[PDB]
Amino acid sequence: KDLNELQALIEAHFENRKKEEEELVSLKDRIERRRAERAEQQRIRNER
Amino acid sequence: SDKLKEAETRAEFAERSVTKLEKSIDDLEDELYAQKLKYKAISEELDHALNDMTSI
């Protein structure tokens, strides 16, 4: 039962850190969106 | 005229600083993305190990 509870919590924190990694990936994605939008608006400013 | 020259020089300095800061923050974001990619890769390898350990 020690092994059972331990593997249970292992898979549990697996899932938790996995959700956190998904959130961080979405963060990186919106981050690259922010990079692209800052790039285009900066470039527009520089064009003018 | 002196005041105008001072202001113009300040503006040029600040603009160059903002350009450098933008490039640096983008580069550091790239580095963080790369390290996150490495962490995710080893995490997926460990998750496969856990999937096999479920049979262990």
UniProtKB/Swiss-Prot annotation, chain A:
Tissue-wise expression: Heart. The fetal heart shows a greater expression in the atrium than in the ventricle, while the adult heart shows a greater expression in the ventricle than in the atrium. Isoform 6 predominates in normal adult heart. Isoforms 1, 7 and 8 are expressed in fetal heart. Isoform 7 is also expressed in failing adult heart.
Family: Belongs to the troponin T family.
Disorder cited: Cardiomyopathy, familial hypertrophic, 2: A hereditary heart disorder characterized by ventricular hypertrophy, which is usually asymmetric and often involves the interventricular septum. The symptoms include dyspnea, syncope, collapse, palpitations, and chest pain. They can be readily provoked by exercise. The disorder has inter- and intrafamilial variability ranging from benign to malignant forms with high risk of cardiac failure and sudden cardiac death.
Function: Troponin T is the tropomyosin-binding subunit of troponin, the thin filament regulatory complex which confers calcium-sensitivity to striated muscle actomyosin ATPase activity.
Name of protein: Troponin T, cardiac muscle
Origin species: Homo sapiens (Human)
Gene: TNNT2
Portion held of the full protein: 107 to 154 of 298
Curated annotation (Swiss-Prot), chain B:
Residues found modified as Phosphotyrosine: 33
Subcellular location, record wording: Cytoplasm, Cytoskeleton
Mod. after translation: Phosphorylated at Ser-55 by DAPK1 in response to oxidative stress and this phosphorylation enhances stress fiber formation in endothelial cells.
Highest taxon in the source lineage: Eukaryota
Modified residues (Phosphoserine): 24, 43, 55
Induction: Induced in stimulated quiescent cells.
Similarity comment: family membership: Belongs to the tropomyosin family.
Entry domain remark: The molecule is in a coiled coil structure that is formed by 2 polypeptide chains. The sequence exhibits a prominent seven-residues periodicity.
Job of this protein: Binds to actin filaments in muscle and non-muscle cells. Plays a central role, in association with the troponin complex, in the calcium dependent regulation of vertebrate striated muscle contraction. Smooth muscle contraction is regulated by interaction with caldesmon. In non-muscle cells is implicated in stabilizing cytoskeleton actin filaments.
More details: The sequences of cardiac and skeletal muscles are identical.
Subunit structure of this chain's protein: Homodimer. Heterodimer of an alpha (TPM1, TPM3 or TPM4) and a beta (TPM2) chain. Interacts with HRG (via the HRR domain); the interaction contributes to the antiangiogenic properties of the histidine/proline-rich region (HRR) of HRG. Interacts (via N-terminus) with LMOD2 (via N-terminus) and TMOD1 (via N-terminus).
Identification of the protein by name: Tropomyosin alpha-1 chain
Gene transcribed to yield this protein: Tpm1
Residues of the whole record sequence present: 229 to 284 of 284
